[PDB]
Structure formats: C-alpha cells, structure tokens
Symmetry: D2
Subunit: 51 residues, 4 copies
Amino acid sequence: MTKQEKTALNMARFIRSQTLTLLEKLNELADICESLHDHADELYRSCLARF
Amino acid sequence: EKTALNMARFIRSQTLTLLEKLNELADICESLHDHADELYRSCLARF
Amino acid sequence: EKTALNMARFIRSQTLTLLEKLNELADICESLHDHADELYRSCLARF
Amino acid sequence: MTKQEKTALNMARFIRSQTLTLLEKLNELADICESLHDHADELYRSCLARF
C-alpha cells in the first residue's frame, strides 16, 4: 500500500460513511419541513375562516 | 387584511417547494453514496 | 484503472452541486422566516 | 381573541421559530458538505498521482 493508495482509501471510506450521515440528517430536515407545511396549512385555513 | 391571507398562502406554497428541493438533495446524496461505495470496494479490491 | 479516476472526479463535482443546492435551500428558508415574522407581527398587532 | 385568531398566531409563531431551527440545521449540513468536498478533492488528487 503506497501513500497515495492509502489516502484514496481513507478518503473513499470517509465519504462513504459521511454520506450516510448526510442522508440521516436529511431525514431530520424532512420531518421539520413536513411539520412546517402542516402548520402553514392550518395557518392558511385559520386565515380563510377569519376573513 | 387581504394581504395577511395572501401571505399565509405564500408561506404554505414555499414549504411545498422546500420539500421538493429536499428530495432532490436526497437523490444527489444517495447517488454520491452509491459511487463512494463502488469506488471504495474497487479500491479495497486492487490494493 | 481509468474509471476509478473518472469516478473520483464525478464524486468531487457532485459535492459542488450539493453545496449549491444547499445554498438555494437556505435562501428559501430565510425568505420563509422573514414572511413568517412579518405575518406574526402584523397578527400580534391586530389581535 | 377568537379561536381562529389564536390558531393563526400559534401557527405563525411556531413557523417563525421552526425556520430558525431549519436554518441552523442547514449550517450543519453545509459543514458536512464542505468536509465531503475536501475529502473528494484529496481523493481525486490521490487518484491522479496514482494513475
């Protein structure tokens, strides 16, 4: 294993593992976004009922 | 009073746009993951 | 061996695309925030 | 404060507060993305040096 070979390996492994983290973090953003949408919808329908 | 209702509708439609953009980010992320994984395996094979 | 290098270049360019898309999500988020804040204030004023 | 008025208020306040959370969560994703980019760049330059 040359220096460049090992580095390429470290880099690919880290990226493989960090993309799973990013995906999981996206799941969390989607949950917030959906809750924001449901609140926005109740907000709109409350405003419609007012005016 | 007509504008508070136009504002609420606008916020509702922007959250729909958010959702769509997140799904496109997620597609890019899984593609990156799949390529990272392929490259890793074929590196772990050769070295 | 020519394809491991084409793969690495592709992963690098996809992370640049990721960054750009995140900035566009962030623009949408701050806009949503600014409208949410305006609506809140003008509601807290009227009621 | 009518029922619809209060709801509109709750909804707008929650959305105001949740958008700050989303923004902060985006800051975290950007940090991961930049680290992914730096690793991808080292990966590429390591591969160039190899081949």
